[PDB]
Symmetry: D2
Subunit: 102 residues, 4 copies
């Protein structure tokens, strides 16, 4: 009876006693989604890690994700320099290092 | 693995060639949801119709809804004075008069 | 160069060590805005207090507000039964009792 | 009296009779912002153009932007392959080609 032109989800989640903002929106042929804490963030494949490094962010990039669950179970593909300084490296499962983004 | 403290959904939908904004968020023991067009809006039971009338809105109030589908199939319980002026009355199925809110 | 058909603001704020979700959106001739905590919420004049009481919410209604600052400095006009049980009463300045909504 | 941990703005704007979704959110040391139409999107420096090309999006990347106005007046730094196919090229002012994203 209707057409959905655009969809967005904004959720406040708590992990290990820390609060994070999960966002998901249609963007292109793939959706855009990220999880942001007070210290850093994790984002899907649309994230340009060169930009994260340029501005000194604590950031991680994951790929092939469509949901919050997928992100938490996904392995970090790229970690920013500031993220590596706090122990986050490519290969880590996001759920295991998300605490460092809060 | 996580706790959802708050959830929000924002969707842009098209009906009869008109664009509307559907919003749903946790609020209390019942969720808050509304559909807004360029001319007026429809909202769940949390809407105070006295306020809508006070400020001259074209507004309709529906009850017992939790989703967009529920709202569109719900019957108008209260219609603002400006809404009644354009033909909307209690009893009308929202889907049948939503065009007047765009 | 463009026309703003609809505007929405979603902010995560911290007060007294507690996290709250502030939301503001165009709705009718007056905007819709609320502040929600884990236990209850405060909303502008569009809130139907009868509904809040019906579903057992801890809720407060304020009037004549357009911004977060206005809400925090506004006096509670109506307090739900559950809100009154925890000490919130009409006349209280929201900022002084917001802690009870988290 | 309060601390803003996270801020987000979601606006529905109309340009040349077409509807677009403007989004802005805190992310890292730079904000995240994009404008999305029914056919494609424009995003700030955080956009990974390699990803846009990988999935076949009609996308443009602009830099040094913080507001909707900045984006519309900004020059396209990178254009996806599908975007170039419809005439969009690096150097174009977004406002002058946004119609092709709707």
């Amino acid at each position: 009876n209707y057409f959905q032109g655009h969809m967005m989800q904004i959720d406040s989640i708590e992990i290990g006693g820390k609060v994070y903002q999960f966002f998901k929106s249609d963007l292109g042929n793939a959706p855009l989604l990220f999880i942001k804490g007070s210290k850093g963030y994790a984002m899907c494949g649309y994230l340009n890690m060169e930009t994260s490094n340029k501005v000194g962010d604590i950031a991680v990039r994951v790929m092939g994700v469509k949901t919050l669950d997928d992100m938490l179970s996904a392995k970090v593909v790229e970690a920013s320099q500031e993220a590596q300084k706090v122990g986050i490296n490519p290969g880590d499962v996001l759920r295991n290092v998300i605490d460092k983004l809060g």
